[PDB]
Design a protein around this ligand. Structure first.
Ligand SMILES: CC(=O)N[C@@H]1[C@@H](O)[C@H](O)[C@@H](CO)O[C@@H]1O
Ligand SMILES: CC(=O)N[C@@H]1[C@@H](O)[C@H](O)[C@@H](CO)O[C@@H]1O
Ligand SMILES: CC(=O)N[C@@H]1[C@@H](O)[C@H](O)[C@@H](CO)O[C@@H]1O
Ligand SMILES: OC[C@H]1O[C@@H](O)[C@@H](O)[C@@H](O)[C@@H]1O
Ligand SMILES: OC[C@H]1O[C@@H](O)[C@@H](O)[C@@H](O)[C@@H]1O
Ligand SMILES: OC[C@H]1O[C@@H](O)[C@@H](O)[C@@H](O)[C@@H]1O
Ligand SMILES: OC[C@H]1O[C@@H](O)[C@@H](O)[C@@H](O)[C@@H]1O
Ligand SMILES: OC[C@H]1O[C@@H](O)[C@@H](O)[C@@H](O)[C@@H]1O
Ligand SMILES: OC[C@H]1O[C@@H](O)[C@@H](O)[C@@H](O)[C@@H]1O
Ligand SMILES: [K+]
Ligand SMILES: [K+]
Ligand SMILES: [K+]
Ligand SMILES: [K+]
Ligand SMILES: [K+]
Ligand SMILES: [K+]
Lengths: 320, 321, 320, 320, 320, 319
């Protein structure tokens, strides 16, 4: 039973904010400064996730959490620690912006893992208790690594985002495959930022968000876009549809955003003017989707929509 | 013409005071509007008309016509304004922002920051606020903050402008130019530069003209924006200068203090934090009342009020020239 | 009789904000734009101070103020003007971020003084009415000059912070001595910004805050640290303990911050996301300390704690 | 009777350097530091010009010169002064970038003239003794202003180059007209720098060089282009053909350069790696053209070719 | 038989330049602007290579050459074209930075290949006539890709250099493996730039040069390093020894450079002050090594030394 | 006897280059990459100096040298080490840009010394064998420290140049005093870069060069100036006259004295640099010989007459 709030009567938006936002407060843990990425999945009787909790030293750490309803979370006070047989890769430097999905027989976690700069760390868990670290998927610099929730043509597949070692002023989404969760390849460009005159919310850089959602018309990708104002970056988010069999081929891509920083909890915080989607839960029977997003890099919010309405919107307003 | 007005709050010593109804135009007035700021407002018939910068949910910059009985509650058209032009090259729309509007002699003219291989000053006219006829871009890129004078100056059209770059420009002097014909422009003269940081830091990074200049016996009243560069970005405040009537590039007085700076939450939080950007004014010479429209955090529009004579005293008393 | 508020019920924090914050509003003077540094000392039957009040021309001026209770302030409308025989040094360009303390027989004030760029101005007063300017202690560019409240083995001592002529993107704390409050030397590096992976609130630059506080164990130094986000700088503050006799030798240095921008008065204003400590009052009998800090470069706030608690926190969370 | 050297034996290039380069040395005047722009035209029985001569103070001044053979120049030691009835426009700050041509009944001079930054100064002369200064044609910031040598459908016409107030890191060529040499307008974009992968000698910025040369199929434009290497800008030059009636319409534009810094006098000097064409003499009856170019912002060189060969090259190698 | 010149009388240097430098001129081809990378190997009874020949449009293209003595080169006029099964990867944008070696049964080529930015293209050939292009090894941004000349414990191995999309101001060498020349992984950091105060010729960025040369004391890596002066980058090159079995482990790393820009052909040209090594030929029986390097990004030079002397220099001067 | 060459026939320049330039080659030492600062003084029956010799690791080191004629130098292969009882200040990180002068009873050496960034290191020697390091005079970031060759109203005095921790894009010359070679103060601004439209060779940044040369008409200061072209910095040098008694007061060049022209000034590790580092002079003949680094690679000499340089500085003054 995924979380849901009906669209307010007369609301014409494709996505609408939970009235309970923020659903995770910045100070939920004794040492937490902010909690703003929630890589959430169903698990047994309820829900589990991997959360970015930055502490009062401003260090970036991952913590495991569980919930009955996916709204109110019990997050472990102590950061998640990985088992790894390779001491070189198993060394912890930092970790942020997790994504989690089940593939075939286990849950896989990706995150932005420090290894001589940002790259994509990979691990798996069967139980959300023990996490086994695998090879970093790519050479630095790379972030926004997001796996597909099944193999594509017999290979594991991941979206990523080549970066630099700062506040990156550019960013294309890429796609890569692996036969074995160790060696990666067949890299393909998915999409670049839009032109400023066409769609400025996504004209500086873009990055994948929640795990792709399979639909009959393609993979639904929810992704962030940045606009560079005189005063900083603004992070909004929107939607595209990727080919099912060859997901680096984009079928439709929204001109308008789905959500942008409007509420005080989105506009004021450690990083003002940020809505950064990190996970989603959905139900194909009803078309409901619940999107988790970080707010001002301070707290976590939830927003709701219908998959068919999102698909319609994405087609109707497509810039390709 | 009955201009909008609120009396000075009891106890208030400031030369300008914000409307208690601010913001007077909300960000979601149109089905697809993301933000509405810059309101290029004038008296028109029974009421008021305007050209409004309404950025959409694709963050495209578009201009929309609006009308109002009271100049506070606006009815803005959902569909963007399109310009008529016989020249296909100049009539191609790329983007447009920060409109200014005034009547000159027989018609209303609109200038805006128009994209033509980068920012320049677009120019158009209308007789009825329904059909708009586009003329030559007045300048080569990069330029913006183009603001016309509301009558000819010794037989020529005149415009303030602001040479720029193709980014978030880290400089800006105000310039003055003339045209005999609304087509060719020239006799360019420097008006003013940003002040020294130690003299008046609200206006030390760059400056730009705001509302249409207001003719007084003491000179043209210029309301203009200024930028201060903090560690965390630009703060846009606005203040006042007085220009010579006959040669308006000659500045007579220029305020040290600002008239208004970002203070309220609707000025401080939004798409671009800490912006008060004046874009138009209505005034009544009989009473000296002036009402100044300004963009707030690049998100909504506000109003502020004051008296022309008090603004002139303030500009002279506090003048940094 | 230093101002005090007891720790809120259940509050686990080493420092807590006054419920009366902001304690000095931005519009206390007829042409003040902001009042956000308050260099406060006990004086006479009450308290005195030098205040940074930027005016509605956005000029940086210092003003004298007085208070019965250290919370409600009566600040002079006219800016403070220094007496100086030397015309060259006595020329006023600008002044900000004052610090004040009693040394031996008079009150000394330091400030960021414009002399072909930022340096550290120095003056004394016996009475908080007339101030007598001395030589600028250093060549530009320097700021965050903070004197020790006694001589250190027979020399005056000062912390400072080499800078540049902009929004400086670096900054180490230094220590210097003078026999005479005119000639300075024996410069020693105190500390550098921490590594991003270790303590990111203090990884861009750091600088001294309140006057150092003598404890049996060393000098308690309360200092600011900067984190560089994509949308600007975030100023937080924390604690270190310096050796009593050779104060450039750091004994402990906190990993977490004591305070970081959280409240709307800290997160919205002329410079968002700033907590900048500028003075403290303390009582060795009770262990109480009250810390004055600028908020968003707009208003002034107060936070409270206990010196022995701050000390034990600094030890236990030390990154050295 | 224009300066000429025959194509060297076995040279396959469309332009070839004079074997006597540089033809104007840096120290022709008693305080000249460099002489590297030579606006040159025929005049009387010989030749005249306006020369950029930077002095030993590194000031940028314009000097008149005269020559019998267009090779050996007698340059006036006193800088050129302009007559102007408007004292505002007539104030001299600096001047560089001259270009000179005859239009209908007199010579016109454009230069980069300081008026609150770079813009295009305009003046006329009948005799190279008195120059009457006209209004600056544009608002700053603009450089590389180059007049057409006749009216275009009854209007004066000028190419220009919007700039900034530094070492400008971009630059498109524009076209503008005037009915009266006072008011300017009908601004049209001519061309942008090419993409790096198409033609990198002209991918950073471009600007007009010598006065446009009329051919039966349009205007031959010789223009500089910049490549941004890790160690600086490299200035090369090449050729384009513009529509005769609407010269903003580009018909052909060379992929390859005509000339790039190769010789030591091009590679070493005040600004290394610079070939900047500033003027040309030509003879339609023979097809001969002699192109004057600055070398390393130090000295002046000459290069020779045939207009029909340049035209053929520009079409055959065109990137449009 | 590899090229050789004996060390000059009384030369104490570990490497010495050929008296015939530069061995390949900039204008060898009818449209060549510069020829400054030479990826050369033995082939049949003489030698072959892939050369970076930038043309007069300043486009970056690869051309095959052949030589009987590795000194006098006959380079094909037409750019090399790669055959590719996949149209998307097979699309040519640009290419530079070639390296060539034989591995097991064929020659492999790597190069800096444009695919939405710089990455490492891979191809093979049996005959230096037909080249078959494989998957790009990595996601952008990357270059200085250099294969090992045999498999390492049964996998192909490659050094690389994460980059950005400009004149990258950083750069560490990385190591990666592949079972199949398609999927890559087990990425390991090799080395970072040295500290400025330790070895400034390699303090900005580093990158691999010639193919690693197997010695009993490790893999001999010859690599470039950059020093950032006020006036640009200076490229020198030096040596390291890598563990034979785990070549990301660096055993010794030289303090001094082996070669730095000294000669006019290294210090003047399209990019001044560059010695950029691209290939080596060696003979284990005599210990002779001949290293090919680009000079000023304009021409190609050769330098000689003895492998045992280079090993001894590397260890004697090690900064590891 | 200071090194000297007569002004070439017909040469109208105030300074003229030695026909023997460069006088010190880049590879004088077994491991030298470049030798381009020569902080030279008369000593004994000859001359002595402290040389910036950057090595083949591109480390910046100081070496002592000696010469009979001040042209052909014998430089010690081993870098100079400084004696210091304070191990914190005595820690060597790097050192460049030395200047050397005699003050009253001994020789002093200043250099740009690494101490958490560039600052001005200070040391003395009685014999050019053992050097004793004193406190760094200033907090970082500071470079171009140049002592006066006598006390000024009973205090040591030094010119300096506030900088940053990179290739500094600005730079004013400052003046400071010390009663004791340990504690410094009375800091005064001497001059700023000129306006681009007035004198562009010195419009980005300036720094003091050789030790100030006393004359009856003021301290003759030879200093570098930078012009920022699209391709980098061009270092030229010129002259100013400072008040004798209060040397932060500038009394009087618009034109440069020397600017990069020769291949050895234009090509090398840092192209387009003439960086003056020391001068020898004889008041009785008016001769001065100025040592300058060329392209941060080698060392050159140029000659002039002090009266002519005074006359040039005054008649072309921009103040
Ligand atoms: C502690 C901190 O500021 N972390 C940020 C991270 O949140 C952000 O995504 C990244 C890109 O802007 O830069 C930094 O690593
Ligand atoms: C969509 C967007 O961000 N537009 C802005 C515009 O508002 C601003 O005035 C200009 C200068 O800072 O930059 C951009 O064009
Ligand atoms: C004195 C000097 O350096 N002048 C240059 C000028 O030559 C150059 O064309 C321009 C653009 O790079 O900038 C400067 O004005
Ligand atoms: O940098 C700001 C924003 O973008 C990414 O870079 C995130 O990890 C956070 O930083 C935030 O959502
Ligand atoms: O860029 C921020 C501010 O300045 C100008 O550039 C305006 O169009 C808005 O952008 C805002 O008022
Ligand atoms: O720069 C913004 C912030 O940091 C320092 O620079 C202070 O003087 C204030 O300006 C503020 O606390
Ligand atoms: O850019 C200059 C140098 O650096 C690299 O980036 C490549 O372009 C090299 O072949 C060249 O030697
Ligand atoms: O800036 C360097 C080059 O280009 C322009 O900018 C010219 O005026 C010269 O300065 C030179 O040809
Ligand atoms: O950096 C370039 C030039 O200026 C200073 O910075 C000197 O030490 C040398 O580096 C050179 O003379
Ligand atoms: K695609
Ligand atoms: K004016
Ligand atoms: K210390
Ligand atoms: K065109
Ligand atoms: K390693
Ligand atoms: K002075």
């Amino acid at each position: 039973i995924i979380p849901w709030e009906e669209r307010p009567a007369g609301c014409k938006d494709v996505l609408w904010r939970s009235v309970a936002n923020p659903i995770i407060p910045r100070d939920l843990l004794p040492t937490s400064n902010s909690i703003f990425n929630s890589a959430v999945v169903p698990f047994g009787d309820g829900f589990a996730g991997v959360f970015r909790c930055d502490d009062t030293s401003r260090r970036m750490r991952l913590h495991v959490g569980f919930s009955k309803d996916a709204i109110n979370w019990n997050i472990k006070e102590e950061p998640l620690k990985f088992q790894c047989d390779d001491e070189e890769i198993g060394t912890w430097v930092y970790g942020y912006d997790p994504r989690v999905c089940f593939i075939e027989d286990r849950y896989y976690v990706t995150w932005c893992n420090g290894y001589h700069g940002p790259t994509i760390g990979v691990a798996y868990t069967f139980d959300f208790e023990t996490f086994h670290q695998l090879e970093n998927a790519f050479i630095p610099f790379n972030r926004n690594g997001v796996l597909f929730p099944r193999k594509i043509n017999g290979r594991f597949a991941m979206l990523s985002r080549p970066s630099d070692n700062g506040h990156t002023p550019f960013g294309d989404i890429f796609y890569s495959e692996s036969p074995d969760m160790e060696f990666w390849g067949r890299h393909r460009h998915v999409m670049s930022p839009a032109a400023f005159e066409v769609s400025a919310w996504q004209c500086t850089k873009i990055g994948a968000g929640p795990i792709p959602v399979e639909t009959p018309e393609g993979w639904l990708l929810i992704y962030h876009g940045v606009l560079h104002s005189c005063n900083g970056y603004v992070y909004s988010f929107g939607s595209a549809l990727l080919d099912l069999d060859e997901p680096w081929k984009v079928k439709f891509r929204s001109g308008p955003y789905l959500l942008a920083p409007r509420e005080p909890y989105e506009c004021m915080g450690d990083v003002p003017n940020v809505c950064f989607p990190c996970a989603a839960l959905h139900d194909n029977e009803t078309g409901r989707i619940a999107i988790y997003y970080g707010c001002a890099d301070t707290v976590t919010g939830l927003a709701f929509g219908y998959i068919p309405e999102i698909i319609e919107f994405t087609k109707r307003t497509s810039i390709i």
